[PDB]
Every structure is written in structure tokens, then in C-alpha cells.
Amino acid sequence: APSYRVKRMDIAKNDEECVVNAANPRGLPGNGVCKAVYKKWPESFKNSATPVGTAKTVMCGTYPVIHAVGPNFSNYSESEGDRELAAAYREVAKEVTRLGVNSVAIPLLSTGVYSGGKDRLTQSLNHLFTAMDSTDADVVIYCRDKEWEKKISEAIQMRT
């Protein structure tokens, strides 16, 4: 079983053994988290395009960057987007297990510019939990908003 913590800081500064990028299907530098990952690990974007609902790892030496493509809710129904978001997280979990890493830095997928204007903290975080519960990794969730940090921490505390 995994452990979970939350940090309010730039995920490009993580101290974990791998990072999950909030990637786009074209493999482009993007904005937000995706652009912060591109700035720190630009070589991880070599042939990183992957479809919505999937994850694709590009290694930077022995440091994995796991590009996870959540849906943009502006282009999906709520129910189809929800399924694709759950799927992206399941694919992250499978990659984390395959890579044998002890810890993983992970942002909340399909928030911000992919959220369709809606607050998707609970939705996205719950799909993260469901997927990562199948691993034994130390999971560190990264956010930038102080209010989201508090809500993620409270959600973590009331699972155990």
C-alpha cells in the first residue's frame, strides 16, 4: 500500500524518484505544470505525444518523466471525460509499478486549463487515490494553491 503527502510547490522542484507530467496529446511544451516540466526536463519531450487517457514514460537518464494525458473537459462530456481521467491515472500507476521507483511526484490531472472552468479537485484526487492505491509507492501530490493544499491534506487524512 502507498503513502500520500501533499506539497505546495513547483513540481519541477520535487525530491521524488520520478515525476508525472500533466501532458497534452500532441507532446507540446504547453503551459502550467507541463511547461514547468519542459523547462526542467526538456529532453523528456522527445516523442512524448500520447493519446488522451494514456501515459507514456520518457527517461532522462534514470529519472522517469511519466507524461499522463488527462482530458480537456471543454472537449468531452462529463461522463466521457471522467472515464478518460480515471484511465490516465490507472496508466500512471502501471508505469510507476513497472519502473520500480520508490516514490512519485504527481499533480492533479485535468485541472486548470483542462477543467472546463469547474473545480475538479475532489474528482481528480479521487481518481488519483483509486489508481495509486494499487502501487506501494510513496506518493507526493504537488499543488500551487494554498486552499487546494488544505483540501488535499484533509482528504488524505480521512482515508486512514
User: The domain spanning residue 138 has which CATH number?
Assistant: 3.40.220.10
Structure-block grid coordinates of residue 58: 520518457
Structure-block grid coordinates of residue 52: 488522451
Total domains in the chain come to: 1
Bind-site residues: 10, 24, 32, 112-114
Separation in Å, CA 120 to CA 13, 85, 152, 160: 24, 11, 12, 22
Q: What angle do CA 73, 18, 144 make, to 5 degrees?
A: 50
Whole-angstrom distance, CA of residue 42 vs CA of residue 19: 13
* Phi, psi (degrees; rounded to nearest 5) at 98: -60, -40
- Residue 7: Cβ within 10 Å count: 19
Q: What is the resolution in angstroms?
A: 1.4
Do the Cβ atoms of 55 and 69 come closer than 8 Å?
yes
Do the Cβ atoms of 55 and 91 come closer than 8 Å?
yes
Q: What angle do CA 136, 4, 29 make, to 5 degrees?
A: 95
Whole-angstrom distance, CA of residue 115 vs CA of residue 79: 13
For cell 510507476, name the residue: 96
Q: What is the domain range of residue 79? A: 3-157
Do the Cβ atoms of 143 and 149 come closer than 8 Å?
yes
Burial 45-80 (b: 16+ CB within 10 A, else e): beebebebbbbbbbeeeeebbbbbbbbbbeebeeee
Bind-site residues for ADP-D-ribose: 10, 24, 32, 112-114
Task: State which H helix or E strand residue 138 sits in.
Answer: strand 138-143
